[PDB]
Write a protein that binds this ligand. Structure first.
Ligand SMILES: Cc1cc2ccc1[C@@H](C)COC(=O)Nc1cc(F)c(O)c(c1)CN(C)C(=O)[C@@H]2Nc1ccc2c(N)nccc2c1
Ligand SMILES: [Ca+2]
Lengths: 254, 55
C-alpha cells in the first residue's frame, strides 16, 4: 500500500495473510469461518500446494501476540475462464482445512448479494484497500498492516483519465478502476488478493480484490480490482459443494 | 423499488409484484419490525468491527 496509514490492530479483522513455505505470498478476505476470497494470479507459480497457509488476526509480522490463527488451505478454486499470466477473472476461493475461531481480531467481511452490490455498493465512492505490500514502488514491504481509502471510477472515466501507453490490457466487465493518477496512493503487487471493502449503513462488504496495475502508484495509472459482484453466484454454489481430492480446483465459470 | 435508495433497506432488497418490496439480511442478522433495519443475532456478525462497536 502506497500513501496510506497503519490499520489500527483489530480494525481490518477480515484481512488474511497468505504464506507459501512461510514466505509472504498474497492477501485475502475471510467471508465466513471456512472460506477466504483471494486473487487467482497469487497461485500461478505454486509448486507444492501443501505449504500454503492462511493467517487471520495478523497485524505485525515481526511479533507473535497470540491473536494470530494459522490454517492450512485445503482447496484453491479458480474459474475455468482465468488464464495464468493474464488479467481477466482474477479471483480464487480458498477452503480452510479447519475453521478459524471468530474473536475481536478475526471477523468475516460480508460477501454481498449481486443485486445489492451492483445497484447500491457500486455507487459508494470510497472504499478501503489493505495489505502488507510495498510501501513504495521498488521499496520494502510493510511490517504492520496498512490501509488506504480509494475512490471508484466508472470504466469510461478510468480510460479517459489514464496515460496513453502501448500493450496495456483492457478493463473488462469483470474489473473496475480505483485510486489516483498522481502517483501518490495505490495498492501494490504484495497487496494482491486483498480486500477492497465498502461501507454501507454501518456494515462493510466485499466489493473488489487487489488485482493488477502497472508499477505501484505510477503517474497516469489507477489500480485495477476484480469486480466481486460478477462472481457472487459462482462463489455461493462452490461454498455449498463437497471438498474434492487435490488442492487446486478449476471450476466452470459462469 | 429496490433500484432507488436500496428500497430503503439497510441490507438486501427483493422486488415483488407491483409496489411490494421485501428487505432481507445477511446470515447472523435479523430484520426488525420496521421491515428495513438489520440487527446482529450473533457475537461476531460479518462486516462489523468489534473494537469500534464496543467503543
Ligand atoms: C495480474 C497481474 C498482477 C500484477 C501485475 C500485472 C498483472 C498482469 C498484467 C499480468 O499477469 C501477471 O503478471 N501475473 C502474475 C502472476 C504471478 F504469479 C505473480 O507473482 C505476479 C503477477 C506478481 N505481480 C507482478 C503482481 O501480482 C502484480 N499485482 C499488482 C496488483 C495491484 C497493483 C496496483 N493496484 N497498482 C499497480 C500495480 C499493481 C500490481
Ligand atoms: Ca503478529
Amino acid at each position: 500500500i502506497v500513501g496510506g496509514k497503519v490499520c489500527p490492530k483489530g480494525e481490518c479483522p477480515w484481512q488474511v495473510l497468505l504464506l507459501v513455505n512461510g514466505a509472504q505470498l498474497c492477501g485475502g478476505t475471510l467471508i465466513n469461518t471456512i472460506w477466504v476470497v483471494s486473487a487467482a494470479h497469487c497461485f500461478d507459480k505454486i509448486k507444492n500446494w501443501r505449504n500454503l497457509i492462511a493467517v487471520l488476526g495478523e497485524h505485525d509480522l515481526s511479533e507473535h501476540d497470540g491473536d494470530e490463527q494459522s490454517r492450512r488451505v485445503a482447496q484453491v478454486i479458480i474459474p475455468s475462464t482465468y488464464v495464468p499470466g493474464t488479467t481477466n477473472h482474477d479471483i480464487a476461493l480458498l477452503r480452510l482445512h479447519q475453521p478459524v475461531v471468530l474473536t475481536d481480531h478475526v471477523v468475516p467481511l460480508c460477501l454481498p448479494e449481486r443485486t445489492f452490490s451492483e445497484r447500491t455498493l457500486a455507487f459508494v465512492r470510497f472504499s478501503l484497500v489493505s495489505g502488507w505490500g510495498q510501501l513504495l514502488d521498488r521499496g520494502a514491504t510493510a511490517l504492520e498492516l496498512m490501509v488506504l481509502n480509494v475512490p471508484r471510477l466508472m470504466t469510461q472515466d478510468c480510460l479517459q483519465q489514464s496515460r496513453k501507453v502501448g500493450d496495456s490490457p483492457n478493463i473488462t466487465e469483470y474489473m473496475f478502476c480505483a485510486g489516483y493518477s498522481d502517483g501518490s496512493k495505490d495498492s501494490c503487487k504484495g497487496d494482491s488478493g486483498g480486500p477492497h471493502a465498502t461501507h454501507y449503513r454501518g456494515t462493510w462488504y466485499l466489493t473488489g480484490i487487489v488485482s493488477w496495475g502497472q508499477g505501484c502508484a505510477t503517474v497516469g495509472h489507477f489500480g485495477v480490482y476484480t469486480r466481486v459482484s460478477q462472481y457472487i453466484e459462482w462463489l455461493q454454489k462452490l461454498m455449498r459443494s463437497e471438498p474434492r481430492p487435490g488442492v487446486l480446483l478449476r471450476a466452470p465459470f459462469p | 423499488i429496490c433500484v432507488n435508495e436500496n428500497g430503503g433497506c439497510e441490507q438486501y432488497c427483493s422486488d415483488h409484484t407491483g409496489t411490494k418490496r421485501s428487505c432481507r439480511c445477511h446470515e447472523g442478522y435479523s430484520l426488525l419490525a420496521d421491515g428495513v433495519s438489520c440487527t446482529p443475532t450473533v457475537e461476531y456478525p460479518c462486516g462489523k468491527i468489534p473494537i469500534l462497536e464496543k467503543r
